[PDB]
Amino acid sequence: SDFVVIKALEDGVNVIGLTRGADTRFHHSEKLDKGEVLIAQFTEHTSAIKVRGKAYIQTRHGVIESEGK
Amino acid sequence: SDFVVIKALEDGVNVIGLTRGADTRFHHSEKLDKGEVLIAQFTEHTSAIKVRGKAYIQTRHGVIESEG
Amino acid sequence: SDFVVIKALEDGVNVIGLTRGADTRFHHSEKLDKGEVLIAQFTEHTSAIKVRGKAYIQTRHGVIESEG
Amino acid sequence: SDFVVIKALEDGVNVIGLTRGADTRFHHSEKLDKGEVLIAQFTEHTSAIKVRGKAYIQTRHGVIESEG
Amino acid sequence: SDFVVIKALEDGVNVIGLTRGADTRFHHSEKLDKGEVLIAQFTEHTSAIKVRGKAYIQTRHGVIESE
Amino acid sequence: SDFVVIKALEDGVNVIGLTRGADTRFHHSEKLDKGEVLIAQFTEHTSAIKVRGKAYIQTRHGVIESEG
Amino acid sequence: SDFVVIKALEDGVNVIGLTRGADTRFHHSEKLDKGEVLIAQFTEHTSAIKVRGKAYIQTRHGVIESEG
Amino acid sequence: NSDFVVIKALEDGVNVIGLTRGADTRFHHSEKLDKGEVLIAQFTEHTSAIKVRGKAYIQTRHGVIESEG
Amino acid sequence: SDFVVIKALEDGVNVIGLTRGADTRFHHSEKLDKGEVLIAQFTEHTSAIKVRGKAYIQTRHGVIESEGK
Amino acid sequence: SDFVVIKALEDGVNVIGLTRGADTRFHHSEKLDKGEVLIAQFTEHTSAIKVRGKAYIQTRHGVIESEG
Amino acid sequence: NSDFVVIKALEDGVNVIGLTRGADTRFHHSEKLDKGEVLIAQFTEHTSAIKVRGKAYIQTRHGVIESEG
Ligand SMILES: N[C@@H](Cc1c[nH]c2ccccc12)C(=O)O
Ligand SMILES: N[C@@H](Cc1c[nH]c2ccccc12)C(=O)O
Ligand SMILES: N[C@@H](Cc1c[nH]c2ccccc12)C(=O)O
Ligand SMILES: N[C@@H](Cc1c[nH]c2ccccc12)C(=O)O
Ligand SMILES: N[C@@H](Cc1c[nH]c2ccccc12)C(=O)O
Ligand SMILES: N[C@@H](Cc1c[nH]c2ccccc12)C(=O)O
Ligand SMILES: N[C@@H](Cc1c[nH]c2ccccc12)C(=O)O
Ligand SMILES: N[C@@H](Cc1c[nH]c2ccccc12)C(=O)O
Ligand SMILES: N[C@@H](Cc1c[nH]c2ccccc12)C(=O)O
Ligand SMILES: N[C@@H](Cc1c[nH]c2ccccc12)C(=O)O
Ligand SMILES: N[C@@H](Cc1c[nH]c2ccccc12)C(=O)O
User: Fold this and answer.
1) Are A58 and G57 within 8 A, CB to CB?
2) 3-class DSSP assignment, residue F33
3) Coiled-coil region(s) at which residues (chain E)?
4) Pairing state of beta strands F55-59 and D13-19?
5) How far apart are CA C60 and CA C54, in angstroms?
6) How far apart are CA D55 and CA E22, in angstroms?
7) Of A66, A26, A19, which Cα lies nearest the Cα of A43?
8) Nearest-angstrom CA–CA distance, H41 and H4
9) Residue to substitute in C19, C24, C43 for testing ligand 4 pocket (most ligand atoms within 8 angstroms of CB)
């Protein structure tokens, strides 16, 4: 199963897993501070992942960068 | 199972799931504000995804950009 | 399964799913306005997809363009 | 399962499904007008496809063009 | 399952399917006129394909031409 | 299953299927006239294939030619 | 099944395994001294791994570096 | 779905020999090729090693090799 | 299943297997002296591997070096 | 399932199959004379293969030469 | 269908040591190689780690490495 790499570029970044199934809502928000890396899979319980905050992201499709409000 | 990366390029972008099955209708619309990134799989419930508003999109077939 | 990306280059583009099975007919027509993007799988219900209107399309086989 | 992309380069192009099985006959013919694209899988019911009329075709093996 | 692309370069091209199984015979011959393309899989009933007539052929192993 | 492409460069080329199993013998010979192409799989019944006569052969491991 | 390589660039790097399942919390923390390497899989019990502290990280998607 | 070897005889009397799969190893078949004939032969439920004797041009997934008589 | 290659660059390198499952602990420490090579899989019993000591390491993601103590 | 190509570069090259299983010993030695080629799989009975004598060897990891 | 390693002895008395798969880890076999011999050895039901002692040229799917005596 695929995974995404997320490196926080400032404090307070949130990687949010959205529930798998007919229902779509946030089940968990993992908070990352500046410099930390989260490597997160898609799973039975998480079928979409949202990133809020400034972060450097790698997936199988390449690099992308989230920008904070 | 594949996924698509969506980065919002302005406020109020909508990433819309369409139901898998005999029936095709919306089911969920995830609102992304500017700079937010959503990475979303195809799933038992979602077999098509629409993007509305200005966003940078990556799939296994390359980059594409939606326009609001 | 494989999926196709379709970006509407003008208003009222139709992405039409043809039923899987012994019978072949349209079960669903998804209208895209200019600039919208539809990322759509082949599925248990859909074994062929037809695009009507000006659009930019990506498949595993590369780029192709439908014209109005 | 594999698919073929067909872009009609003139009106009245026919994309014809041939039946899977001991029997071989045409079970469906999809008519494409100029600039329409059809992306069509091999399936339980369709194990060979025939294109008649001027079209641009992509498959896993590359590009080929049918002529009217 | 893999497929072959055949483009007829002249009228009257035959794409012939050969039976899978202990015995080998032709069970279908599809006629292609000039410019028509057939894309044909190997299947439960067809384990070999013969092309007669002038055509441009593509497979996973690249291009070949019948005459 | 893998397949082999054989193009006959002279009349009378033989493409010979050898039986799968503890016994090895020829079960079929398909005769090809100059310029005919045969695309033939390995199968439940055919675990080796022999070619006699002048032909251009393609397999997954590249081109080889047989000579009469 | 995928794995990540973590090389500690200073003492006390913390590799944190998050529980697979409807609930998310950490179930194990493996500390690495400077120059030590951990090569760790995604598993039935771990579906996300967080790195705290200065580390050089390799995954299938390339190199990334955590900073303390 | 198994791998296969291509053997082109470069002289008469080339032998492609199949060795039995299983606890017993022996030759179970020897296919004679004359000059310029080609044999494309799979590994099988009965054949888990293949010996070539005589001068032949051989292709496997590992590339070209040549046997010498 | 994946494996890692470890070549000891000094005496006394440890290649340590961590238990698969809900419990995580070391279950084995393989000592390598200089110049010895260990090629070790992930397994039903080992889902993470730690190297301590100076070693040259190859994985499917490429070369990494552990630095000694 | 993998295979090794062995080309004898002198007479009496010995290709030795080691038993799969909890015990390890040789169960077959196949001698090759100069210029003969053996293409041998790993199998239910052979999980390690030893070559003695001068031989040119291909495996999926490249070429290697034994020295006799 | 497992991975395999290629070991070529560069001196006499090289040892290719198979380690037991499973909860317990011990040497179950040491195959001794003399100079110039090549062993091609799979990972298996019984062997989940392989140790090489002595001077040898090694190939695996991650590249070449050399053990030293
Ligand atoms: N318990 C969660 C852990 C997780 C994996 N990937 C995530 C992405 C975002 C948030 C949480 C997660 C799960 O198995 O799904
Ligand atoms: N619960 C939804 C989550 C989701 C995944 N991909 C999406 C794309 C668009 C909207 C929602 C989704 C599902 O599993 O299908
Ligand atoms: N409910 C439809 C959704 C769909 C997927 N791909 C499409 C292409 C065209 C039209 C509809 C669709 C299905 O599961 O098949
Ligand atoms: N109902 C048809 C739809 C179809 C798929 N590919 C085609 C090619 C040609 C004609 C029809 C089709 C089927 O599932 O087979
Ligand atoms: N009914 C035939 C159709 C077919 C597929 N490929 C072919 C090649 C030649 C002739 C017929 C065919 C089958 O499923 O086998
Ligand atoms: N009926 C034969 C047809 C065949 C397939 N490949 C061949 C190669 C050579 C000769 C015959 C064949 C079979 O299924 O095996
Ligand atoms: N009847 C033999 C035919 C064969 C396949 N590959 C071979 C290689 C050599 C000799 C014979 C063969 C088998 O199925 O195994
Ligand atoms: N008996 C251990 C052997 C082993 C494999 N890889 C390892 C890595 C480190 C330590 C021990 C091992 C197991 O099967 O898991
Ligand atoms: N017992 C843990 C070991 C582990 C694997 N990968 C990890 C990553 C982080 C922390 C622990 C681990 C497991 O099998 O899941
Ligand atoms: N009967 C043996 C034949 C064999 C295959 N590969 C070998 C390598 C060496 C010696 C014998 C063999 C087997 O099936 O295992
Ligand atoms: N009987 C051993 C043979 C073996 C394979 N690879 C090895 C590596 C080292 C020592 C012995 C072996 C086994 O099946 O596991």
Assistant:
1) no
2) coil
3) none
4) unpaired
5) 20
6) 39
7) A19
8) 5
9) C24
Provide the 8-state DSSP code for D6: E
Q: Which CATH class is domain C1-68?
A: mainly beta
Place of tokens 């629409």: B50
Interface of I with G in 44-63 (CB under 8 A): 47-52, 54-55, 57, 59-62
Q: Which residues contact C17 (CB under 8 A, 6 or more apart)?
A: B24, C26, C27, C28, C29, C30, C40, C45, C46, C48, C49
* The residue type at E62: G
d(CA G50, CA B39): 18
Alpha-carbon distance K33 to K46, whole Å? 20
* Closest ligand 6 atom number to CA of residue E19: 1
CB A66, CB A52: distance < 8 Å: yes
CA atoms within 13 A on the CB side of D19: 10
Q: Which two tokens stand for residue K47?
A: 């062997």
Q: Name the residue in chain J with its Cα closest to that of H41.
A: J39
For residue A64, list chain B residues with Cβ-Cβ distance below 8 A. 5, 7, 37, 56, 58
Is the separation of the CB atoms in B39 and C40 below 8 Å? Answer: no
Bridge partners, residue H64, by sequence? H59
Token pair belonging to H34: 């004359």
Are A29 and A6 within 8 A, CB to CB? no
Beta strands in G1-68 (DSSP E): 3-8, 13-19, 26-32, 37-41, 46-52, 55-59, 62-66
Query: Using CA atoms, how far apart are residues J44 and H21, in angstroms rounded to an integer?
Result: 8
Whether residue F41 has its Cβ less than 6 Å from ligand 6: yes
Q: How far apart, in Å, are the Cα atoms of K36 and each of H68, I16, K56?
A: 23, 32, 9
Instruction: Name the method of structure determination.
Output: X-ray
* φ, ψ (nearest 5 deg) of residue C4: -125, 145
Residue C2 half-sphere exposure, CB side, CA atoms within 13 Å?
21
CATH superfamily of E1-67: TRAP-like (2.60.40.50)
Contact B7, B41 (CB under 8 A): no
Fold classification of A1-69 is Immunoglobulin-like (2.60.40)
Tokens read off for A25: 């809502």
Burial of J27 (0-12, 13-18, 19+ CB in 10 A): middle
Point out the ligand nearest to the CA of residue A17.
Answer: 1
Pocket test for ligand 1, best of G2, G18, G28, G42 (most atoms within 8 A of CB): G18
Domain segments of chain F: what residues? 1-68
Q: Is any ligand 5 atom within 6 A of the Cβ of residue E29? A: no
Structure-token match 């039901």, residue found: K45
List the structure tokens of H46: 């009965």
The atom of ligand 11 lying closest to the CA of K42 is 6
Q: Considering CB atoms only, which of H21, H22, H60 is closest to J39?
A: H60
Q: What is the resolution of this structure in A?
A: 2.0
Contact by Cβ (8 Å): F20, E40: no
Write the single-letter amino acid at G37: V
Could you tell me what percentage of chain K is helix, strand and coil, using 3-state DSSP and rounding each to the nearest 5? 0, 60, 40
